[PDB]
């Protein structure tokens, strides 16, 4: 239902707790499932307090008031996945928004690089301009596009990579696609990034 802590920056060997708020006065105990990044989900807790045979003793369930909480006493490097809560409404099974845990780490400011469209793309007729951000850790960031100081919208698309296993960092890239006529009409293209590790937003600009 309402899995409020949708992101948890938990360290190793720490006790963690997440909560599922049944947003309805419907009587159904919450069953807690775990899904690794890519494979099928596994069952952890049933009836909001029991323990499925096979899971470690760390996982525990509780029901405080009208919400349902799941706790992990110690967080080994194995329990880094996403967790879902399942409830029943008459005859329909409802899962939750989802709760993903995250490895805590010192905040790093991303390095921003800008790549203009290449001359090989011009012959095709559509030009793509990209800016990438590397080595940052919060997962949040803002990327905005400014062409001749005009703020574009609806023309850019951004993607972000999964956390690394060497320094648990991130990286993202945003691409803007424009036809040849619109690309030739304008003069200056800029990509600005705002982040929590940055005192002020940083902009990379180039003139064609």
């Amino acid at each position: 239902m309402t899995q409020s802590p949708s992101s948890l920056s938990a360290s190793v060997g720490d006790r963690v707790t997440i909560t599922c708020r049944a947003s309805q006065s419907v009587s159904s105990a919450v069953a807690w499932y775990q899904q690794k990044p890519g494979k099928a989900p596994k069952l952890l807790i049933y009836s909001a307090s029991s323990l499925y045979s096979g899971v470690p003793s760390r996982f525990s369930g509780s029901r405080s008031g009208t919400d349902f909480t799941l706790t992990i006493s110690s967080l080994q490097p194995e329990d880094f996945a996403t967790y879902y809560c399942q409830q029943s409404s008459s005859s329909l099974i409802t899962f939750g928004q989802g709760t993903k845990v995250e490895i805590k780490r010192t905040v790093a400011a991303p390095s921003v690089f800008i790549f203009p469209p290449s001359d090989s793309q011009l012959k095709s007729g559509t030009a793509s301009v990209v800016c990438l951000l590397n080595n940052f850790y919060p997962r949040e960031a803002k990327v905005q596009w400014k062409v001749d100081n005009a703020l574009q919208s609806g023309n850019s698309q951004e993607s972000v990579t999964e956390q690394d296993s060497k320094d648990s960092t991130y990286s993202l890239s945003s691409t803007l696609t424009l036809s040849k006529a619109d690309y030739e009409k304008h003069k200056v293209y800029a990509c600005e990034v705002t982040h929590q590790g940055l005192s002020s937003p940083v902009t990379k600009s180039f003139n064609r």
């Binding site: 409020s4 802590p5 920056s9 805590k104 010192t106 905040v107 790093a108 400011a109 919060p138 929590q196 590790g197 940055l198 005192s199 002020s200």
Partner: peptide, 28 residues
């Protein structure tokens, strides 16, 4: 969040505290 700036230097990140239940993050 808290930042610091040394005299004749730039402004760098120091620490941040988010809303309740989200934790706090510190610089290296």
């Amino acid at each position: 969040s808290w930042f610091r700036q040394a005299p004749g230097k730039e402004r760098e990140f120091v620490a941040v505290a988010r809303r309740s239940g989200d934790g706090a993050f510190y610089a290296d």
